[PDB]
Amino acid sequence: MVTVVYQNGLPVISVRLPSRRERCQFTLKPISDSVGVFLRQLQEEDRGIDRVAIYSPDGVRVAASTGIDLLLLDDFKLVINDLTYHVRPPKRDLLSHENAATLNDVKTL
């Protein structure tokens, strides 16, 4: 199964990759990473991947330029080679992401 879990305010997507026995996790920046960034990371991780794509639950291809914040507003399908994974991210506000991974009362100069 492909899962999405927020850790320190950022989405961590855990994926079974075809060449690998063990799961691998991908942490993404919702406000600046795109669908295409994530798909490129998958391909870089496993040379056994010949095809990767993301689709809406209704089966419509999602544009590579789409922000990860927008992707994670709802369910989606992740195709890796000949397997399609139904991904169910946890719901949170689109506004949620603007203070992600910030430590309260410590600012960097």
Task: Write out the residue range of the structural domain in which residue 55 sits.
Answer: 1-109
Asked if 63 contacts 39 with a C-beta cutoff of 8 angstroms, the reply is no
Asked if 62 contacts 34 with a C-beta cutoff of 8 angstroms, the reply is no
Domains: count for the chain: 1
**Residue whose structure tokens are 């798909």:** 39
Q: What is the resolution of this structure in A?
A: 1.5
Asked if 11 contacts 4 with a C-beta cutoff of 8 angstroms, the reply is yes
CA distances from 38 to 26, 32, 41, 60, 105 (A): 8, 11, 5, 18, 31
| Residues across the chain | 109
Technique that determined the structure: X-ray
58-92 CB burial, b ≥16 within 10 A, e <16:
eeeebeeeebbbebbeeebbbebeeeeeebebeee
Asked if 94 contacts 100 with a C-beta cutoff of 8 angstroms, the reply is no
DSSP assignment of the chain, as one string? --EEEEETTEEEEEE--TT-SS-EEEE--TTT-BHHHHHHHHHHH-TT---EEEE-TTSPBPPTTSBHHHHTTS-EEEEETTEEEEE-PPP--SGGGGGTT--TT----
Sheet strands side by side (includes 10-15): 3-7, 10-15, 24-27
